[PDB]
Design an enzyme around this catalytic site. Structure first.
Site: not given
Lengths: 8, 330
Positions: B35, B199
């Site tokens: 994770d 992004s």
């Protein structure tokens, strides 16, 4: 079902 | 040194991937969930309260000759879903894929929440975020990745997760046969201790790319792809028959739909998620409704590039002193 394993 | 291990989805929905990890001496193999959105390595153990242990494999620190108690030390963690565990701390040898760290902190659960007990396939987690997220007190402990970096050939790890298929975690080198074209790297912010990046925009299907900064976290430990409400709504306006469902919690569509692809920007490069990846599956066995894999992060608080986005690419986690994240099509 779906997983949310960022730590919060 | 380097490590390579295979990572397999826990179910036919790819909800989560587990990777085997060898802890102690001699080695006990436990299937951990790697994770990138947390920083603790914790496992079900012989300390765990027996009625909260199901089918999991446990670590028994008293059978490991290399185990030592980290005295004083305790940890307690809570995840995005409200799930939780806590317990105390040993250091021990831990190997992934052949890569051996000694004096790695292994957090021993005393207690685990209902969702962990119910998940027979996951014997605990391995956190891959920055070590400033670690729950152990009163001194925080380094993740496996940070303990490994002295001896790594390259201070990196890659995630090559599979769609309905196994994949690989490598440590310490980038397999240049695993992807196609070239890796674009983007800068990582550690301010909030995540693999956090921005992004550069998005497109739905064959439509135009929209230049827009979307700050989010790459989180292997989150299944679905959590985008701001208005990007997700532009996505599902292209699938006729898609609707938001309060009952089920999120956008749902007929299972028969051919979904469009979703593109996300990494610098000047583009990663396309095939539309069949966004088909999570149906909301009940036999049902004709399916749940979508792209949803709002509005009640999260933060955008999460989860497994549906990551499994579409080959991801490099660049753990240099200025870290970066790298993405290639595959």
């Amino acid at each position: 079902x779906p997983f949310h394993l960022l730590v919060y | 040194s380097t490590g390579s291990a295979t990572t397999t989805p826990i179910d036919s929905l790819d909800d989560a991937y587990i990777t085997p990890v060898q802890i102690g001496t001699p080695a006990q193999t436990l299937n951990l969930d790697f994770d990138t959105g947390s920083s603790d390595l914790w496992v079900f153990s012989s300390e765990t309260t027996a009625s909260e242990v199901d089918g999991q494999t446990i670590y028994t620190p008293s059978k490991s000759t290399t185990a030592k108690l980290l005295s004083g030390a305790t940890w307690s963690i809570s995840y995005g879903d409200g799930s939780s565990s806590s317990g105390d701390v040993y250091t021990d040898t831990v190997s992934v894929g052949g890569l051996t760290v000694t004096g790695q902190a292994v957090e021993s659960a005393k207690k685990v929440s209902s969702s962990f007990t119910e998940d027979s396939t996951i014997d605990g987690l391995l956190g891959l975020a920055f070590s400033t997220l670690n729950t152990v007190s009163p001194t925080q402990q380094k993740t496996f990745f940070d303990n490994a970096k002295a001896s790594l050939d390259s201070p990196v790890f890659t995630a090559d997760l599979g769609y309905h298929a196994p994949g690989t975690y490598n440590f310490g080198f980038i397999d240049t046969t695993a992807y196609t074209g070239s890796i674009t790297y983007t800068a990582v912010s550690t301010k909030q201790g995540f693999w956090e990046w921005t992004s550069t925009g998005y497109a739905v299907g064959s439509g135009t790319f929209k230049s827009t900064s979307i700050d989010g976290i790459a989180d292997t430990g989150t299944t679905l792809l959590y985008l701001p409400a208005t990007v997700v709504s532009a996505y599902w306006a292209q699938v006729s028959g898609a609707k938001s469902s309060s009952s089920v919690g999120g956008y749902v569509f007929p299972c028969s739909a051919t979904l469009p692809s979703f593109t996300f920007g990494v610098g000047s490069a583009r990663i396309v998620i095939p539309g069949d990846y966004i088909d999570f599956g149906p909301i009940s066995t036999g049902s004709s409704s399916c749940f979508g894999g792209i949803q709002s992060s509005a009640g999260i608080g933060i955008n999460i590039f989860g497994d549906v986005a990551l499994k579409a690419a080959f991801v490099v986690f660049n753990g240099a002193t200025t870290p970066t994240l790298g993405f290639a099509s595959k």
